[PDB]
Amino acid sequence: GTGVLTESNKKFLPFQQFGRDIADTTDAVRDPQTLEILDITPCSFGGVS
Amino acid sequence: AYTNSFTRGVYYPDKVFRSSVLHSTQDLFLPFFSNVTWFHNPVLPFNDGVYFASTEKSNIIRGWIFGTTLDSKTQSLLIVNNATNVVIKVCEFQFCNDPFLDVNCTFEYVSFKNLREFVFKNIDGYFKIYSKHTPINLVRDLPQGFSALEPLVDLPIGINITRFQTLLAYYVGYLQPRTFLLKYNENGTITDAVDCALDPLSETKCTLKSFTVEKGIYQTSNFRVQPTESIVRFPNITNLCPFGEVFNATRFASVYAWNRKRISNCVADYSVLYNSASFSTFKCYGVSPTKLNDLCFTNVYADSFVIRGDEVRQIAPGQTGKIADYNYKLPDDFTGCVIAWNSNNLDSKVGGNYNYRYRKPFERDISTEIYQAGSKPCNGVEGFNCYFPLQSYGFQPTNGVGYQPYRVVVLSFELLHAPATVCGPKKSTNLVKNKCVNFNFNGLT
Amino acid sequence: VITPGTNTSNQVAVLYQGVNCTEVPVAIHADQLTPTWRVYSTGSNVFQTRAGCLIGAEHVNNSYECDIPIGAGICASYQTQSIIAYTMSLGAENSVAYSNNSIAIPTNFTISVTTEILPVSMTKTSVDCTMYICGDSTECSNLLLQYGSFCTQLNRALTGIAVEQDKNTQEVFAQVKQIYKTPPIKDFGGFNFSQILPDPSKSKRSFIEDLLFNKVTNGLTVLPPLLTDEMIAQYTSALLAGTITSGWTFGAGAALQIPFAMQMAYRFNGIGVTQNVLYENQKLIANQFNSAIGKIQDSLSSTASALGKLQNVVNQNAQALNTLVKQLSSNFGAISSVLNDILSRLDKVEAEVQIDRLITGRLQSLQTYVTQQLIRAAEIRASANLAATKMSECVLGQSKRVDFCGKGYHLMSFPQSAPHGVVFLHVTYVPAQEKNFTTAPAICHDGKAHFPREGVFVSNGTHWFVTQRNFYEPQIITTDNTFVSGNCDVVIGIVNNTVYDP
Amino acid sequence: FNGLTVLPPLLTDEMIAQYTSALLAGTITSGWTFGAGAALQIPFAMQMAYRFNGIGVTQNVLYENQKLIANQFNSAIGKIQDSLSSTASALGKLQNVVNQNAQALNTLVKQLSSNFGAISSVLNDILSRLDKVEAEVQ
Amino acid sequence: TMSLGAENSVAYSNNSIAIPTNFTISVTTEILPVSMTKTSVDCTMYICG
Amino acid sequence: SALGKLQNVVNQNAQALNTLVKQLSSNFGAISSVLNDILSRLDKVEAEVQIDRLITGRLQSLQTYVTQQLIRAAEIRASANLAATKMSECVLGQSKRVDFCGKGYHLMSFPQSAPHGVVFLHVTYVPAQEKNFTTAPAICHDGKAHFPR
């Protein structure tokens, strides 16, 4: 993916490895080396007016 | 012997965290309130996947064996919780139905008031295990209520399980493809589920994606009456079509003056042609060749000739050139088959069978009249601008294959419009009325 | 599936629409091939209706009011329990006591307060259609150039919607030329507006505006409204403060102060009730009004189901955007819905032949979303024009249009703001406790026939009086309450009496 | 029958006929009063005097002409029968709503006959004539 | 930040009234659209030239 | 700038037609957007795939225009119903519906024609030069309350 990776408090179960929004977009991941959870936040976009 | 499954046998379907959401999925699950087989060992059919559970604390239920034979003939699963660890191996084992005490190897691995429950399935050669443990007091039935089973093992071991057994208080049931609504709580855990087919209220919950639904009337489904039977109504023709006379004839015509035989009022088994190894090509256009024995026609026309193997590329829909526009051209929407074979074993002379010769949709001119190819009136004599129209095939016995003779039959099919007249080897049924039925009238399904 | 609500019970009844019961439990329900719609030859009872075969419900001959509709005059309800189904009753049947010389006149009244709720604006939304279709993949973005204007006319269409939602919001609330504000003293003759005026301690919304604001619950971008919720609450404050301090006058030139009891005396005189009826009953009228505002706080606190017309706008936007985002996952016949799969797996001609499916599907999906918003925005604009009209006529005036500004005779109304909409509190007069009287069209005196100047003639059975049409107040029949035309010959049903001369 | 379906309205015509009767019987017996509150009975000629004040005609003008005014009204209602019985094309505004929905459905159904560039408009032809890999293109 | 307008404390009391002593006749223009350009496209000629 | 309502109704139809015409030049994935190129450069069996891409694009382009015109025509119909109402209530009468026939107390209005529209001069009475006074709801005389007629 592309995004701002951020530290997060979404308490995954031991076997859970990534997480999803209501519209199924991925919005969290475990780092497979240090087993804490990252939030994935989309990189900014918008209209230039 | 049997027991109620209640709402047991849901497992976490994926490694995906979801918060406080009523997610929905379709998968192999144990259906709610189904009959579960009960035991107090036998060899059991595995079907599409298993739910297994037992009341235990002794570990007399040491594990399981799974495979086709469960012994000798194949790599086969052995699983044993040996109190030191869960031990797994998949060897070509040599053991009977009870290798335990009184009370190749392509993979291996090492890890009542109580009950343990498990789910086993295999997909794409990945054998997969889910589990849970619990205390209980009502061990006299499968425990009412809900908690989620969770994964342990997922391995590409490839063994086709069809049978299994326990190793020496337990129950067995089977997974089925169903749609579920799953209540993930505000902590990433499944805490409740709806089996959508269980009753019209469960269809309604699954339609609204909610465990509670308001007072009202909700559409969940469409009903249609189903066919009770199938009907074949066909012509009662007894005659069989002359394909031996078409294909095995003494000599085919020239491509410039091609023959055509009508086939009518007979049953045609095109598998007699289509199965034959003899044909170098069997190019069928508006119909697939596999289907020909199931269709029906108003007429069939076998156009036929012998022609040089190189020109087969012009014997196709909408083509142009000397073989096509000056000999035999197919229409752009040709419904039919081009059937041919190399005929060098019969049509080839000792140096040149010059009797075979070459120069609109299904057009033919039989005339050998001189091409008056310019201003000079040729009056039947060749010269400059004055040429005999028919070139001759030099069919010797050892020509290169593009220069060899080939025998051709092109079947053109007349579709059903008028009544059935050439038809497949289908057998007519009795006729049923007033019921819903599938039907087939002369190929009109 | 017909359901009592899972809150109340788990029983259900099922309707097979248009199907005949001689087929239904003999088909894909019961005794045939039966995917999903699992078997019962009778789920409790089977009952044919004009709407279809109805199963599980119990037929009943008492015509109740309709709880759940089915169709063709049938309804279902949960009662002593089972799901009963019945032909509905339209209402209680009342033979009016009509006769050619009898009239009923109210001897007393009730003030009432009623709530009306209207949508005003959608979520202002816009989409980068190249980012939606191609996700910054260059090969897809280059294929999309072959389609020309499509990913530009879509932005022009959504821009028209987004600008209109600011206009609707401005047209409804910005009716007032200046921010009128309330006196420090609260001597409004006994009336208590404290629940609908600003709470200065909070945003500075009223108490009831805070009930309303509590009860309502990528390639895509969502844009803020031009006016903040704090600005909208200042316009509802100004419209309310004008109405309390100056009547309708702030709707036609500059605001003119007037004592609130005298403003109410004009509102009464506008509905044909003589103004002395107000000043003589002022404490009773204030007690009815102060009580009626309290019932609105209870009504909006007791259920969230009241705001359904506003809540539905928020739900319809969420429904559409979730659908538009989910449509990214669809195959449309392509070998993958993830564009980089196609680009990694296939040679460039095979990849572009596939990617043009995803572009075609995503474009057909995006035109479908924009076309729904174009239609939905016209429906919201038809409501916003009505809300602008309601505020112009009811709040800034006293509309005489029957049932336009709430039920009963209209007195005045107060606007309160709510999420994506507006809420009116319409105040109305309802006549309440009638008596029968004998009546006549004219009275004959010294051969001259007298008619009433205002009101109507009545008798208690021994004496004749004149009284106003909307509140019983009998008076002596004089030359000053009456006027003459003709004589006793022409009028039907004329009676003899003395008509007194002062 | 082609995957189309039509549904009944919630209120049947005899229920609508009860509402048009009730509104009319209220209006005749009780003026506008049954809108604002309970139906207060009033003599019908006296209700017409209240209607005449509403248009700036002094009410004695009704009572001094009541037989004439009743005759003009009774006569005028009779002409409405003749107008409706004569001229069906007066209901164009209702007939149009029928005719549009009928042509919308008939256009949706006739479109099943279009090829769109496939071998047949009949889906079972492709499934009979072509093997599955070829059929799925059509 | 946009201004909503001036602000104005109306001089209310239980015994004060303001009465106008003069008037302006005032003329207000209002403009409304009523019809589009009547337009037709022959699809047979637009698509296939 | 006052006539922005009418000038917008001229502008929107121009932008729609210019967009509908410009789309004839788009390829839609055919080898040319000009039909006579494909007809002259290709045999029919090749040309028919190219021409079916152009038909597909030009048809979807035209459906989009007609759908916008149907929705725009409903917006202008709603405005014509409002204008027809203002004509009957303001011109042929004297309305009492606050702010309907122009701001202030309504006296009358005069129509004037305009291209694609109508213009009303609403004539109104607006009060001015207010004076403060002391007031009371009623007066008592011989112990009896008098109210103004």
Ligand SMILES: *[C@@H]1O[C@H](CO)[C@@H](O[C@@H]2O[C@H](CO)[C@@H](O)[C@H](O)[C@H]2NC(C)=O)[C@H](O)[C@H]1NC(C)=O
């Ligand atoms: C009927 O006669 C015509 C000539 O009058 C035949 O025309 C042939 O047309 C094809 C292309 O369609 C040309 O390639 C041939 O060269 C033409 N033949 C000659 C001899 O010029 C036509 O084929 C005849 N009809 C049938 C059924 O064969």
Ligand SMILES: *[C@@H]1O[C@H](CO)[C@@H](O[C@@H]2O[C@H](CO)[C@@H](O)[C@H](O)[C@H]2NC(C)=O)[C@H](O)[C@H]1NC(C)=O
């Ligand atoms: C008119 O109706 C009001 C209620 O709307 C009557 O007021 C009630 O009168 C009873 C005694 O008759 C009291 O117990 C209640 O507390 C009163 N309620 C209020 C709100 O004051 C009133 O009496 C009626 N007027 C007449 C003249 O009959």
Ligand SMILES: *[C@@H]1O[C@H](CO)[C@@H](O[C@@H]2O[C@H](CO)[C@@H](O)[C@H](O)[C@H]2NC(C)=O)[C@H](O)[C@H]1NC(C)=O
């Ligand atoms: C106006 O009415 C409000 C309530 O509608 C009165 O305020 C409430 O009074 C009760 C009893 O004293 C308290 O329980 C509430 O907490 C009060 N609420 C608030 C927000 O103050 C208010 O006192 C009345 N004012 C007048 C002038 O009568």
Ligand SMILES: *[C@@H]1O[C@H](CO)[C@@H](O[C@@H]2O[C@H](CO)[C@@H](O)[C@H](O)[C@H]2NC(C)=O)[C@H](O)[C@H]1NC(C)=O
């Ligand atoms: C009809 O109304 C009149 C006037 O109120 C009633 O006449 C009065 O009756 C009382 C006794 O109830 C006497 O004290 C008055 O002197 C009477 N006044 C006059 C002018 O006669 C009359 O009683 C009422 N009739 C009915 C049937 O209630």
Ligand SMILES: *[C@@H]1O[C@H](CO)[C@@H](O[C@@H]2O[C@H](CO)[C@@H](O)[C@H](O)[C@H]2NC(C)=O)[C@H](O)[C@H]1NC(C)=O
């Ligand atoms: C109104 O009063 C007049 C008398 O002032 C009544 O007229 C007389 O009625 C009697 C009985 O019917 C007749 O014998 C006389 O010939 C009538 N005189 C005239 C001049 O007509 C009249 O009947 C009373 N009307 C009502 C309805 O009571």
Ligand SMILES: *[C@@H]1O[C@H](CO)[C@@H](O[C@@H]2O[C@H](CO)[C@@H](O)[C@H](O)[C@H]2NC(C)=O)[C@H](O)[C@H]1NC(C)=O
């Ligand atoms: C008012 O006009 C009506 C007609 O619109 C007149 O009524 C008719 O009068 C003539 C005699 O003049 C009768 O022959 C008709 O039969 C009447 N028509 C009806 C329906 O009754 C009426 O006379 C006029 N009144 C005045 C005062 O001029």
Ligand SMILES: *[C@@H]1O[C@H](CO)[C@@H](O)[C@H](O)[C@H]1NC(C)=O
């Ligand atoms: C990977 O190694 C690092 C140290 O090299 C250690 O901190 C980390 O926990 C390890 N993670 C796993 C999953 O082994």
Ligand SMILES: *[C@@H]1O[C@H](CO)[C@@H](O)[C@H](O)[C@H]1NC(C)=O
């Ligand atoms: C299977 O389950 C049904 C209830 O779902 C029950 O009636 C039936 O007795 C069960 N079958 C057996 C063999 O007990």
Ligand SMILES: *[C@@H]1O[C@H](CO)[C@@H](O)[C@H](O)[C@H]1NC(C)=O
């Ligand atoms: C369990 O298995 C291991 C080998 O996997 C073996 O060494 C060990 O002795 C076993 N323990 C018991 C208690 O059987």
Ligand SMILES: *[C@@H]1O[C@H](CO)[C@@H](O)[C@H](O)[C@H]1NC(C)=O
């Ligand atoms: C292991 O596989 C080979 C063939 O690959 C087979 O001959 C042999 O019998 C297998 N081993 C056992 C113990 O059966």
Ligand SMILES: *[C@@H]1O[C@H](CO)[C@@H](O)[C@H](O)[C@H]1NC(C)=O
């Ligand atoms: C599994 O069984 C099927 C026949 O049922 C066979 O075709 C397939 O090759 C087997 N696969 C493995 C990995 O044993």
Ligand SMILES: *[C@@H]1O[C@H](CO)[C@@H](O)[C@H](O)[C@H]1NC(C)=O
């Ligand atoms: C989540 O789990 C923690 C303990 O891990 C518990 O304290 C908390 O109450 C749980 N919250 C929910 C919403 O289940």
Ligand SMILES: *[C@@H]1O[C@H](CO)[C@@H](O)[C@H](O)[C@H]1NC(C)=O
């Ligand atoms: C042609 O003859 C051979 C035997 O000589 C036979 O096997 C074959 O079936 C015949 N051809 C057809 C089309 O039946």
Ligand SMILES: *[C@@H]1O[C@H](CO)[C@@H](O)[C@H](O)[C@H]1NC(C)=O
């Ligand atoms: C069902 O909902 C109503 C309000 O809609 C509530 O009064 C009732 O208590 C609920 N039923 C139960 C069993 O609580």
Ligand SMILES: *[C@@H]1O[C@H](CO)[C@@H](O)[C@H](O)[C@H]1NC(C)=O
């Ligand atoms: C339902 O079907 C039966 C025949 O099975 C028929 O006699 C009856 O008239 C039908 N009822 C209705 C309401 O159409």
Ligand SMILES: *[C@@H]1O[C@H](CO)[C@@H](O)[C@H](O)[C@H]1NC(C)=O
């Ligand atoms: C309903 O009423 C009819 C008579 O109108 C009677 O025959 C029937 O038994 C009643 N049914 C029920 C369920 O009360």
